[PDB]
Amino acid sequence: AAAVADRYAVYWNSSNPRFQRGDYHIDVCINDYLDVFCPHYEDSVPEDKTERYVLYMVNFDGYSACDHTSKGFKRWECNRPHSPNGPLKFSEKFQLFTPFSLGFEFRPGREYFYISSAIPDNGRRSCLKLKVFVRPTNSCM
Amino acid sequence: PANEVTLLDSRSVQGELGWIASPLEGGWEEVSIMDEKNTPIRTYQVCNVMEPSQNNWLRTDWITREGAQRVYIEIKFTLRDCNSLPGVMGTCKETFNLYYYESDNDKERFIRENQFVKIDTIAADESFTQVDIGDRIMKLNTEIRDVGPLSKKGFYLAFQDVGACIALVSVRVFYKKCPLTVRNLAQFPDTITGADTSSLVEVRGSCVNNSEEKDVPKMYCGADGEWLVPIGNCLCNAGHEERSGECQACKIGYYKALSTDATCAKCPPHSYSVWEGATSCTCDRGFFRADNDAASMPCTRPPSAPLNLISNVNETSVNLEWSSPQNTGGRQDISYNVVCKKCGAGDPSKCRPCGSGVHYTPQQNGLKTTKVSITDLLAHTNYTFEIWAVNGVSKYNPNPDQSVSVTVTTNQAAPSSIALVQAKEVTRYSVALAWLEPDRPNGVILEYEVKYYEKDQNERSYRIVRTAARNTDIKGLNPLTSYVFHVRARTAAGYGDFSEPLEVTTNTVPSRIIGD
Numbered sequence: 001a002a003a004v005a006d007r008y009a010v011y012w013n014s015s016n017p018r019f020q021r022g023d024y025h026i027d028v029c030i031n032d033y034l035d036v037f038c039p040h041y042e043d044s045v046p047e048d049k050t051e052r053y054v055l056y057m058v059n060f061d062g063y064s065a066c067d068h069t070s071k072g073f074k075r076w077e078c079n080r081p082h083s084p085n086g087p088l089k090f091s092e093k094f095q096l097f098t099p100f101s102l103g104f105e106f107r108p109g110r111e112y113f114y115i116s117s118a119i120p121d122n123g124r125r126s127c128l129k130l131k132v133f134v135r136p137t138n139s140c141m
Numbered sequence: 142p143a144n145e146v147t148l149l150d151s152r153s154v155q156g157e158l159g160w161i162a163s164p165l166e167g168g169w170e171e172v173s174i175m176d177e178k179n180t181p182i183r184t185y186q187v188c189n190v191m192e193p194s195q196n197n198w199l200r201t202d203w204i205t206r207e208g209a210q211r212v213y214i215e216i217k218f219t220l221r222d223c224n225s226l227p228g229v230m231g232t233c234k235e236t237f238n239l240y241y242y243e244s245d246n247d248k249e250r251f252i253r254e255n256q257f258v259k260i261d262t263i264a265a266d267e268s269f270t271q272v273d274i275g276d277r278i279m280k281l282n283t284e285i286r287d288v289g290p291l292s293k294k295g296f297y298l299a300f301q302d303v304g305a306c307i308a309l310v311s312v313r314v315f316y317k318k319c320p321l322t323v324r325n326l327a328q329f330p331d332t333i334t335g336a337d338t339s340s341l342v343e344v345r346g347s348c349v350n351n352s353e354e355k356d357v358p359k360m361y362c363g364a365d366g367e368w369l370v371p372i373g374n375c376l377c378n379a380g381h382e383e384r385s386g387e388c389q390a391c392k393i394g395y396y397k398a399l400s401t402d403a404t405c406a407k408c409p410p411h412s413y414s415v416w417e418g419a420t421s422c423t424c425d426r427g428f429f430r431a432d433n434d435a436a437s438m439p440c441t442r443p444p445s446a447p448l449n450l451i452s453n454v455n456e457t458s459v460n461l462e463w464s465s466p467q468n469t470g471g472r473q474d475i476s477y478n479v480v481c482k483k484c485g486a487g488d489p490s491k492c493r494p495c496g497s498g499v500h501y502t503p504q505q506n507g508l509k510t511t512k513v514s515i516t517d518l519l520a521h522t523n524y525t526f527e528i529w530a531v532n533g534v535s536k537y538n539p540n541p542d543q544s545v546s547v548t549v550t551t552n553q554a555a556p557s558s559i560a561l562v563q564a565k566e567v568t569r570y571s572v573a574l575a576w577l578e579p580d581r582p583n584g585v586i587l588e589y590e591v592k593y594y595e596k597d598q599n600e601r602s603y604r605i606v607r608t609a610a611r612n613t614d615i616k617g618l619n620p621l622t623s624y625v626f627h628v629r630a631r632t633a634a635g636y637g638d639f640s641e642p643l644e645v646t647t648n649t650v651p652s653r654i655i656g657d
């Protein structure tokens with residue numbers, strides 16, 4: 001395939017080591033994509049023998065404490081573990097300007113944060129989380 | 142709504158919507174977003190407002206048209222102001238192009254480069270700005286366009302971006318139909334609209350279970366999915382009424398006689414319907430309806446006996462008068478019949494019918510008033526009368542207590558003549574007479590009167606003798622002399638006619654009273 005732009009892929013389950021010390025982070029350039037994949041299972045699996053969560057984009061202070069409340073914005077629902085064709089996919093473009101009114105904007109050299117709450121609803125002091133650093137233009141071009 | 146049928150819904154394509162973008166990268170891009178409904182959804186967006194020339198295509202899957210000919214497209218989107226995009230001088234646009242093409246090939250893999258046909262240029266009514274992002278105002282546009290008449294199994298839709306900054310929130314594609322409905326007790330099927338937005342489709346209806354067609358049921362289907370002004374109707378069969386859009390059977394205790402009747406009514410007085418769907422009511426026990434009839438009209442009964450039977454009598458004539466019964470049943474067709482009889486010590490009802498050439502004025506039968514005058518009958522017999530209270534029924538239940546009887550004893554008049562007077566013994570000075578009772582006494586005979594005189598007009602003396610017995614001895618007469626005798630009878634009404642003259646001449650036979 002063609003590209004100018006890169007896509008970072010991220011599998012969000014708790015099986016995923018990159019999450020372990022709660023320090024998963026990526027460096028992206030502007031107009032790159034991040035693709036978070038949801039946990040997705042075999043048809044023959046009970047929907048409660050199953051990991052599901054809600055993804056939230058939150059500031060530093062709520063990156064620290066695993067807390068979305070009054071911190072950021074709901075972004076995705078990973079609740080559909082038997083998703084018809086592949087896992088449920090959240091795409092994020094790290095663009096300067098949104099064509100969507102209630103979309104999201106990103107500046108170079110700034111840094112951005114994602115966390116999640118489960119559908120098991122447990123109040124966690126512990127959550128799977130992601131820091132994204134959007135590089136300076138002079139590491140990109 | 143109930144009149145729109147979806148052929149495509151981007152939000153509803155839960156199995157992920159697979160559309161061809163050309164270019165596959167750097168043009169329309171699918172990107173995750175929270176909608177007006179707060180659902181997380183994939184949508185396409187493009188924002189390449191800084192390049193000199195842009196040509197970005199996004200094309201849907203093949204969309205089967207079903208049977209529709211006029212298809213609507215409703216696009217929800219957001220478009221950003223070129224003012225709010227910094228330093229975009231020359232190239233930024235605020236519109237996008239909308240295309241379709243028809244095809245029976247559902248697996249055309251590659252966006253056609255020629256064959257697409259422009260539906261419209263779509264502009265926004267609420268272009269958005271930095272502030273809206275700031276405050277989380279989602280200025281969401283809706284535009285609808287429509288295409289057709291469509292002829293192939295399916296079509297594709299496309300969107301071309303030439304330099305706007307835009308986000309397609311939803312695409313929904315549909316056609317319109319007039320929904321299944323019942324009008325004037327005819328059923329009309331789901332009907333797809335016609336080829337143009339001004340097309341009417343004529344639809345013939347089917348009479349609902351269970352009803353009959355009056356005028357052929359028809360209705361027109363409007364382009365906007367509203368049924369237009371109908372013509373024709375069906376009527377609910379007898380025993381059924383219209384409720385909702387059905388002909389339901391009449392409730393217990395209710396009936397409907399003809400289809401041309403409005404609704405069910407309840408059974409009128411003294412009739413009942415024990416079954417649902419009743420076209421008639423079965424009259425109650427002892428009740429009936431005349432040949433001149435309406436099943437609407439209540440059932441009635443034979444009346445009671447007429448009242449205050451009041452008799453007047455003249456010598457050989459009875460005048461009668463009575464009053465309306467206690468219970469008429471009831472109806473205005475009450476009449477009376479008079480019945481004559483003859484009895485006496487025969488209390489047992491041993492009464493020959495008297496049938497004769499009597500009247501009976503004015504009628505004797507089917508009588509409307511409460512009076513009747515009987516004439517031309519025999520003097521000293523006990524007649525019996527029955528007066529019968531009748532109506533339009535009672536031919537269906539007759540009975541002697543619908544009548545009251547007067548046994549009446551007639552008046553008396555002066556008797557007939559005797560006809561037979563005989564001389565039993567003749568002496569020189571006496572005539573012994575004997576006679577029979579007159580044929581018609583016409584009453585109680587009180588006495589008899591004998592009138593006699595000499596046959597010769599010269600020296601003639603008229604003499605009279607009275608008696609209770611049917612015989613007498615006229616004494617003291619001239620011997621060898623011819624006499625004439627007449628006899629008459631008397632009742633309280635007067636004298637009968639004198640008998641035919643009896644001529645008797647005294648002889649010379651010695652009187653034994655005289656002796657020696």
Ligand SMILES: *[C@@H]1O[C@H](CO)[C@@H](O[C@@H]2O[C@H](CO)[C@@H](O)[C@H](O)[C@H]2NC(C)=O)[C@H](O)[C@H]1NC(C)=O
Binds near residue numbers: 011013015016039
């Ligand atoms: C859990 O996440 C793991 C990785 O952390 C997923 O594993 C990847 O699955 C993809 C897509 O099928 C493969 O292409 C990768 O190579 C896999 N990596 C590994 C290490 O196996 C895994 O599928 C996720 N699964 C569920 C069910 O949540």
Ligand SMILES: *[C@@H]1O[C@H](CO)[C@@H](O[C@@H]2O[C@H](CO)[C@@H](O)[C@H](O)[C@H]2NC(C)=O)[C@H](O)[C@H]1NC(C)=O
Binds near residue numbers: 486
């Ligand atoms: C008409 O009717 C009566 C019977 O109802 C006849 O005789 C009557 O008999 C009763 C005694 O049982 C007496 O009072 C009288 O002798 C009669 N009744 C009346 C009211 O006078 C009677 O003879 C009949 N008349 C004729 C002409 O046949």
Ligand SMILES: *[C@@H]1O[C@H](CO)[C@@H](O)[C@H](O)[C@H]1NC(C)=O
Binds near residue numbers: 455456457458
């Ligand atoms: C008896 O009455 C009838 C009818 O009213 C009448 O014609 C008849 O002359 C009457 N006889 C009399 C009054 O003696």
